[PDB]
Amino acid sequence: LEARFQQAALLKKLLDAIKELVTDANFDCNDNGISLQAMDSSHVALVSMLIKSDGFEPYRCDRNIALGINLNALSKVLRCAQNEDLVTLKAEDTPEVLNLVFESEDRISDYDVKLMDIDQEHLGIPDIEYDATITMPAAEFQRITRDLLTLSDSVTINASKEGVRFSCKGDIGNGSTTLKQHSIEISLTQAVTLTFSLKYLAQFTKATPLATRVTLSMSNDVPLLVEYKMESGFLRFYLAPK
């Protein structure tokens, strides 16, 4: 395994989004790229990463490898890189250490992160027909979930012709913000109404700096899909309703 990124800031940002929610995970490396799929401690939410090999300069993974990593440890080490820097990931003899090298143009830093052993599993993600979907500024989805969380633990989300509606009830009082089809795109095939923990949605919005747009997809009694799309891949969160 040898993979190099143009910019170290985008690796930093991914880990910032994931690490609060997942402490340990396997990074599954292929010819197609590096991917990650994991649950939170409580099996309520699921994360799926994909950085395609397109987003690497000299990217090369001969055989298929799984790298078990504490994501805090990785984040600490990634903070030692400047945003401007050239990251290089290397994994050579044993899945016992992951090597990172940061450079610019101009000096060199390099670090080793101790790996661990995690288990293989396949939570199958039934791909499907989402009755309603919204896409909007990532910034605004962040603003709303931030603000609602200060009033209560849960939000309920209504999708209809009226537009899409986010509702609270808490001790302070209650209320709602609603968005219509103005940029905010909507597509409902039906109406859907579900309730979710704002603790989890707030953690998903740490992905805001990876993409200026975000996409929420729903169907009755089916986990919500929050998707942040990037070039050369994606980050996705699946959340079970209450």
Partner: peptide, 10 residues
């Protein structure tokens, strides 16, 4: 009260 993904297919 909250339910898990195992509850919705998975």
């Amino acid at each position: 009260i909250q339910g898990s993904l195992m509850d919705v297919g998975m």
